[PDB]
Amino acid sequence: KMSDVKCTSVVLLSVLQQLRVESSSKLWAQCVQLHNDILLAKDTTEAFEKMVSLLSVLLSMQGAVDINKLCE
């Protein structure tokens, strides 16, 4: 299970990278921290914590038109 969590996180930070988020600094800091952490996790819970506490970072952006991708 959780193994997919680590994976999804790798994909995800790669996305936030290529969306040119590193023009900020403090962003790149908080993100790279969340990454470097779950990639040492131990229990699905606090993982999912840091997971959403990241993801929302992306959500606050407006490069993604998720109303599309949620086409299923």
Add this chain to the structure above:
Amino acid sequence: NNELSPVALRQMSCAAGTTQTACTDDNALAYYNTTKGGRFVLALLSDLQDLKWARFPKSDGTGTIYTELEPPCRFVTDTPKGPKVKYLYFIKGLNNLNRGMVLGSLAATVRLQ
């Protein structure tokens, strides 16, 4: 609490003089240690006022060494007819270790004034 060195330094007589050529064949008293390299020599003992050179056959007797001497150390031994002046030359540039063990064996052998 830390004793230095029980000795075995021998003493012979041989040749020394004031210059390279002035060394007569019998006038000096060598103190030495036969180490890995022949009768390796340490110090000279004499009665003459000055001797700045010495000459000793090699390990096998090829040539004669031209080993200069120190500004000799002054002291007086005793012979049954009173005090007697003696000098202790060292082979120049001889560090404190062998100077020390030579003084050890020597002052052991000869009681001074």
Add this chain to the structure above:
Amino acid sequence: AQSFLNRVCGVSAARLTPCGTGTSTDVVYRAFDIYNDKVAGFAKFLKTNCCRFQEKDEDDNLIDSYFVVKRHTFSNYQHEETIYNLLKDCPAVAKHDFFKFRIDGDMVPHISRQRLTKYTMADLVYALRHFDEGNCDTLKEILVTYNCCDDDYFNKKDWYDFVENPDILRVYANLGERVRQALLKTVQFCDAMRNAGIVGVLTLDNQDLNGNWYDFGDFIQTTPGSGVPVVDSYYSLLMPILTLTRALTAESHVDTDLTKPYIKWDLLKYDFTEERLKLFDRYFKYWDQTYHPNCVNCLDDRCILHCANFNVLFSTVFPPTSFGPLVRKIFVDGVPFVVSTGYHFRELGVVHNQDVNLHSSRLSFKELLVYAADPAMHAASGNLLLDKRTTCFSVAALTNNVAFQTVKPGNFNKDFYDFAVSKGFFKEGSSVELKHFFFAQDGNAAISDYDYYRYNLPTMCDIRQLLFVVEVVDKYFDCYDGGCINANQVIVNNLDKSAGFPFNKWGKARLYYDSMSYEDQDALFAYTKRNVIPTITQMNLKYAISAKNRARTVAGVSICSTMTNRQFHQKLLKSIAATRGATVVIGTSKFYGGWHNMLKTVYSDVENPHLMGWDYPKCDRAMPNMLRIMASLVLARKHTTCCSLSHRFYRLANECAQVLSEMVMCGGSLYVKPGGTSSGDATTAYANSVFNICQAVTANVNALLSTDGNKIADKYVRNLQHRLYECLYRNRDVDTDFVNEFYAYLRKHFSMMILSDDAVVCFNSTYASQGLVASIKNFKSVLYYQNNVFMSEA
């Protein structure tokens, strides 16, 4: 009983309190330096010919002073007497007092050493070299005794560390001054013991911890004005403490006084010599082989070691600006330039170029190159910088805005993973589970890493046992061959890598290895055998799988270094790389059962075999300099014909300027690299291996001597150890018989396989338990006292 106790309170401070027993002696576990005719070593015996009184204080508190009364032979009683009576003057003498007292019907003599100190310099130096946190207490009790720190500190675990809790340094530092005090008194002592004309040797376990002396036994008489001491056990043991505790720091103040501020050497004074030599003549006076500051004047390298130490000490008193290149202004056809005409290392004194030339019109490719890589031109024209993120002494800037680094994530490979789960993998509770990943790194990655050189200290490494185990290590390398070569014989692989800086603004090494004849390269080479070429360096961030989220760096070196060090070492480097069946095993495939062969070698009949490895905690930052020079020297040893002398010496100098301590273009700016190696030059994995062997040997030497004397059974090995000590301190020059003997002894009971900084040792078990082969605890001790980090036993 008391009349005695009374009668040894002599005349002073009658406040005594025998922490002994009654009128019997005492039993103390004290760590001597001993060498009779039969035993030898630096080891912790049980001594008992002494009655011991703890002098108390008004208000009837205890107080660190002692009356130690010894009882021995009448004859010896006289010797000690007449000697003491000759020498009751030079204040470094603990004020003795003799007497005759009766025990029963026995008129036993007694000597009364007055006001000493519970310990001696021995217990210090010993229980600091042979540390072991499981039971280091005497360290605890000293450090609180001299107010270095209050007891509470010690329960905060990781108080002994270094990579951790590095504030520990200051604690040790608090002691330093008092050590210095000792030195001075001893010199006074030596002078007296000369002019009064005495002979004997000074040993540590005659030294109350303040400074006085006492145990005057074995000295013997002589003419006055001609007395000799023997100071080569003393210093040569005291050496490395002398820059743990920094016993020289009270020498930069306005008058060697802790109160006053500092001297201020005028910014321009780079020379500094009669200083160096004066310090030496005030402290290490009675040393017994000449010292000649500028190492240029040294002879066969071994004199270069015996003066590179004293410089690595006297150079923590001078200021850290006047170290480094020495520029000067020249004229390229009537055009002002600034170029580095010399250098001024922290050890190798002053060094001056030898083919320098002002006023030149048109300058060719060679010197053009050698000018674009000197930092003189670069930093002489740049914005002054000041950085508050490191401590490494910054120097200059270049741009007008620093650059920030980042290390992107890795990218996924979904399918293979989807496959993987489809084959029933990663199903929870598996015993295989992802563990290595592409960690990501934020902004200030580099400098927040390059900071680590602050883990690197100066050090003085004991000089005698070093001047020996360099010889044994040398013996490990008598089956190869090397020397200078020529252009058409170097061999480059993947001639397409980086080219440092600034040459990387123009392309890879294709150009520079291409845009030059062979004669070009030979002019270069046979040039640097008489000059110096300070260089730069870049730091790079690695980007590859890992398991620990730290950073990584690799020092990309500038082309004018490799392009010579190759030519100078290639023959050897091959000769090692391609030989099968030896100690160093760089370059032997693990395919086609070559691995199995490696093992069935490094076994090879050692009787009772156990296997042990280890690992070096932060290996390439914390390696002190002395050991790096030792590596470079052992490699160059085989160059005895191609080279000469001054050729070598300048070649060593060029290397020590190009890899040891030169500027580091980290980020967008220039710093200094105070020490430590640099994992990117031409001669690493080899040099790391050599250093490693040096550690393993030194550990075994200590493990031998450290052992007691009279429990060794094999009379042969006892006579070994004894002979070893003799060859090591008493002697001056090599005992090839003995060295071959030793090397064989090791190959028989301590065989070892080495990759660059990665070992395996197969060793003779019951020996270990008998301590005649360095089991682990000795590794703790060595990594401590001369790599000053702490190698955990996990």
Add this chain to the structure above:
Amino acid sequence: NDALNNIINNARDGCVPLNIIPLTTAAKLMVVIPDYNTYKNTCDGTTFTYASALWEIQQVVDADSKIVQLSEISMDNSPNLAWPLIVTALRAN
């Protein structure tokens, strides 16, 4: 700069160690700063001496190279800044 030619004439021999050339003769100073505390302890006010010479602040850019006046740097406007501010001071004279 003349100042150099000065400093080299003043030499004992025409040799000066490198580490005191950019220090004394050079002009425009850059400074890095990691924290607010170090800021207010080392480059507080509009000017300061250092290496025994005066220096004037020009602009104080930050990590994203956003000009930042010498006002915003309060104690408490600090936790809203990219923190390794670059102060570009000048060889005051």
